[PDB]
Design a protein around this ligand. Sequence first.
Ligand SMILES: [Cl-]
Ligand SMILES: [Cl-]
Ligand SMILES: [Zn+2]
Ligand SMILES: [Zn+2]
Lengths: 22, 22, 22, 22, 22, 22, 29, 29, 28, 29, 29, 29
Amino acid sequence: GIVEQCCTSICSLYQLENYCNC
Amino acid sequence: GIVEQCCTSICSLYQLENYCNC
Amino acid sequence: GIVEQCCTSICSLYQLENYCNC
Amino acid sequence: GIVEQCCTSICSLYQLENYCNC
Amino acid sequence: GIVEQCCTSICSLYQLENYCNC
Amino acid sequence: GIVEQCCTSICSLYQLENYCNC
Amino acid sequence: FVNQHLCGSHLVEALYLVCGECGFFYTPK
Amino acid sequence: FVNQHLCGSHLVEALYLVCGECGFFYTPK
Amino acid sequence: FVNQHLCGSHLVEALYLVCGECGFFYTP
Amino acid sequence: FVNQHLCGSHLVEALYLVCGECGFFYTPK
Amino acid sequence: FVNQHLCGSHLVEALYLVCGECGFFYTPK
Amino acid sequence: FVNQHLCGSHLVEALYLVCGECGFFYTPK
Ligand SMILES: [Cl-]
Ligand SMILES: [Cl-]
Ligand SMILES: [Zn+2]
Ligand SMILES: [Zn+2]
C-alpha cells in the first residue's frame, strides 16, 4: 500500500497520483 | 457531502466517523 | 508523559482523551 | 481568549508566549 | 545546512531565524 | 506577491512551480 | 473557494486520525 | 509503528493537494 | 464556527514551537 | 528512533481535535 | 489579515511538496 | 530519506512562522 511504498523512500508527485480517485 | 456538512458548522468526532470506510 | 506513552506506541482516540482538560 | 486575540489579527512571538506553561 | 542542524536535534526559533531572508 | 495571487483563488500546480528554485 | 480548500485540508487530517485502520474517503464538493 | 503513523498523516495531506477535484480513498491496508 | 476551528489548529502548532520544553495550555 | 519533537507536533494536533471544547495542557517534560 | 496568514501556511506546505529538492523562495512582500 | 522529508515539512512551517514578513529561502541542499 501507500505506507509501504512512500514511508522510507520519498514518493514523487507522479507516484502519489496513482492513489487518487479520478 | 462532508464539505457541505462540515465546513460551516464543526463536525464532531462522532459525525466525522460517518465518513470512515469501515 | 504523553510523549513517553504515545510516541513509543500509537495512542487510540480513547487513549488521547486521557490527556484532555475535560 | 487566544481565539479572539489571535484569529482576528496575527499574533507576534511575544503575544503567543503568554500561553506557555513555564 | 538546516537539515543537518535541525533534524538531528531541536532547533529553537532563534536558531531557525538565522535561515530567514531579512 | 504570492499571497495576493494564491490566497484569493487556489493556485494551480504551474502557478506554485513559479516559486521553486530549480 | 479558498475557504473550502483550507477546510478540506484539515478535514483529511481529522479523518486520518478518527478512522484509523478503516481509512476514509474524501470527495470534495 | 509510530513512524508509519506520522508518515501517513503527511501522505494524506499530499494526496489532498495532488488529487484535487478527484478526491481519494485512504486505505491503510 | 469552522473558521475558528481551523485557526485554532494553527495556534496550537505555533504554541508548540514557541513554548518548547515548557509546553502550553490551550483553553478555547 | 521516533523523533520526539516531530511526534509531539502531531500529538498536539490530535489533542486539539479529540479534546474539543475541553482543550488541553501539553506537558512534554 | 489572519485569513492570508493561515492560507500562507498551507502555501509553503504546498511549495515544499511541489518543489522537492529544488527548494523554493517564499517572499510575502 | 523520508525522515528528512517529514522533518523538512515541519521546518518550513516553522520558518513560515518565525520569518514573518521577511520570508525565507528553503535550500535543502
Ligand atoms: Cl486554515
Ligand atoms: Cl513527522
Ligand atoms: Zn489551515
Ligand atoms: Zn510530521
